[PDB]
Amino acid sequence: MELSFGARAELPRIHPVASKLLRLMQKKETNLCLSADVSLARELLQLADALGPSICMLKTHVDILNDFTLDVMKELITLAKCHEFLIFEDRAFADIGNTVKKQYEGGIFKIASWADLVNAHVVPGSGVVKGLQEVGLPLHRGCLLIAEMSSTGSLATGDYTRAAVRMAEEHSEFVVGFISGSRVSMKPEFLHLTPGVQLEAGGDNLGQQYNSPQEVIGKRGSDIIIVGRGIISAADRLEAAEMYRKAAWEAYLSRLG
Amino acid sequence: MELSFGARAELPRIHPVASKLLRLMQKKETNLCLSADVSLARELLQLADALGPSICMLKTHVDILNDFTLDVMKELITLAKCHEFLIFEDRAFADIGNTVKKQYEGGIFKIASWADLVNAHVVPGSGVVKGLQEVGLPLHRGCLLIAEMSSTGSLATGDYTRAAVRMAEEHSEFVVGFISGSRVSMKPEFLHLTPGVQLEAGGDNLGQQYNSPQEVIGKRGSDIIIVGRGIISAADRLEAAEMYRKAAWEAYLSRLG
Ligand SMILES: O=c1cc(O)n([C@@H]2O[C@H](COP(=O)(O)O)[C@@H](O)[C@H]2O)c(=O)[nH]1
Ligand SMILES: O=c1cc(O)n([C@@H]2O[C@H](COP(=O)(O)O)[C@@H](O)[C@H]2O)c(=O)[nH]1
């Protein structure tokens, strides 16, 4: 009884951020999230403008931007609104609730002011979600819980993954899905976003492992592929993004029937 | 066959950063780490200057400082050198190796340029340590692995904790100890630093749980207490720091015999 992204956008328990995302995925025929892993604001913004039509989401690591300013994020928001994609800051919050609330709202980055989505590790227990929610609920934001990781020797397996799923399902007012390698929740209101994706087999020299869009979306049942170097290191990043988009989209359609 | 901090500083396999720390702990009769959880640079620096003589370490969350600049960290280093304490940035790195290396070296914060110590979660597998090491070894830095957490519902238990200890013991050129609630390694070259510490029983409203210095150092065998609000929210932060210092030090001495 698998539903399209557009039908999932209308589910009774859908979060507004998830709904917005699912609708634009359906409209634009994309379930690709660009991992914009660059150190220069100009490159970030040039990528966001050129690839915006091809992506449902742009994932940032703001803490690697050498020339971060809040005005850069204002410019990114303009592009996100123009091309219709969400902004996801991959901060992987992983401390006690009292601390992560400050890390989310404050400091130099003011992440909550510009990020539609953030993510959190579940290792601290559910206080990490409660802390983030105190800032994110008033700001109408969503959160993803890291249920599995793509890297060699990941401990996010077995009962750890099951604990992530329970924590999500128990904080559905704020948690809209997962970072995972596969479908981990049976509830269709939750999004599954999967990093560690390339067309070719391989990995990197620091524990990253790759699987293909057909494997991740088609066989493992995830929703969205997150792709960094597969696109960013390519000469023509637009064509690379289109190849990943078409791969992930067709894998999704075939799983739908 | 328990050894003093000063003797542990001389162990054959001791890391240089651990040795420096252990020597100043012995010299100053302090095993207190101040968790300087403030949002203003002026308050951070006033705390570091006044409390510097009472502490072996000052722990930062640079990402909650509203007015962070690299010049603030230069001023903090001057104080750390004057009063003899290490600087520990509690960044809790928790991503793939390729990403954390950039988060450690680069961006606005340039953490590796000023932090003696950082910490990492073990959930991504050992690539998190390998990535950090590529930056930290050339810069003569050390790392702490998060083996246990103080918060309600922590998943850093059982085999997860055992995996943290193995990962530390296998990367002893860079990893100098743990964030933990107790002694988790039997090897005396490793430091144990414990947050979730207050004199009085209690917790916070976002999953923090407190135990006393006597419990953590004396009964659970940890080395250093990490104390934030117990000191920071007190009217007289200097006297508060002295109370925590004397508590942790005497608990240590009594465990020594
Ligand atoms: O399990 C995970 C969780 C992540 O955040 N990531 C992130 O997703 C991206 C993967 O990038 P790449 O496609 O270049 O390997 C990185 O930004 C990394 O930080 C991951 O690779 N695996
Ligand atoms: O398990 C852990 C790991 C932490 O980093 N911390 C950190 O240690 C400090 C505890 O501060 P406090 O004493 O105010 O509760 C915080 O900065 C928090 O981020 C913790 O409390 N428990």
Query: Residue ranges per domain, chain A?
Result: 1-257
Question: How close, in Å, is residue B120 to chain A by CA atoms?
Answer: 10
SS3 category, A205: coil
Q: Whose CA is nearest to atom 3 of ligand 1?
A: A149
From the CA of B57, how far away is ligand 2's center (Å)? 14
What's the Cα-to-Cα distance from A238 to each of A21, A201, A232, A235, B196, rounded to whole Å? 21, 21, 9, 9, 49
Q: Relative to the CA of B156, which ligand 2 atom is closest?
A: 1
Going by the DSSP 8-state scheme, the letter that residue B112 receives in this structure is: G
Q: Which ligand is nearest to the CA of B200?
A: 2
Report the run of H or E that residue B120 belongs to, with start and end: strand B117-121
The letter for the amino acid at A200 is E
From the CA of A196, how far away is ligand 1's center (Å)? 6
- Cα–Cα distance for residue pair B232/A145, rounded to 1 Å: 31
Strand partners, B87: B58
Q: Which residues of A106-133 are buried (b: 16+ CB within 10 A; e: fewer)?
A: bbbbebbbbbbbbbbbbbbbbbbbbbbb
Given a contact cutoff of 8 angstroms between Cβ atoms, the answer to whether B221 and B183 are in contact is: yes
What's the Cα-to-Cα distance from A55 to each of A49, B86, B175, rounded to whole Å? 11, 45, 39
The separation between the first and the last C-alpha atoms of chain A, rounded to the nearest angstrom, is 11
Are β-strands B191-194 and A224-227 bridged in parallel, bridged antiparallel, or unpaired? unpaired
What's the Cα-to-Cα distance from B191 to each of A144, B18, B55, rounded to whole Å? 33, 7, 16
- Cα–Cα distance for residue pair A138/A101, rounded to 1 Å: 12
CATH topology of domain B1-257: TIM Barrel (3.20.20)
Strand partners, A178: A145, A192
From the CA of B196, how far away is ligand 2's center (Å)? 6
Q: Hey, of A64, A66, A227, which one would you mutate to test binding to chain B, going by the most B CBs within 10 A of its CB?
A: A64
- Cα–Cα distance for residue pair A103/A95, rounded to 1 Å: 10
User: In B123-172, where does DSSP find H-type helix?
Assistant: 127-136, 159-169
- Cα–Cα distance for residue pair A218/A22, rounded to 1 Å: 18
Q: How many CB atoms lie within 10 A of CB A205?
A: 11
SS3 category, B221: coil
Q: How was this structure determined?
A: X-ray
Given a contact cutoff of 8 angstroms between Cβ atoms, the answer to whether B61 and A102 are in contact is: yes
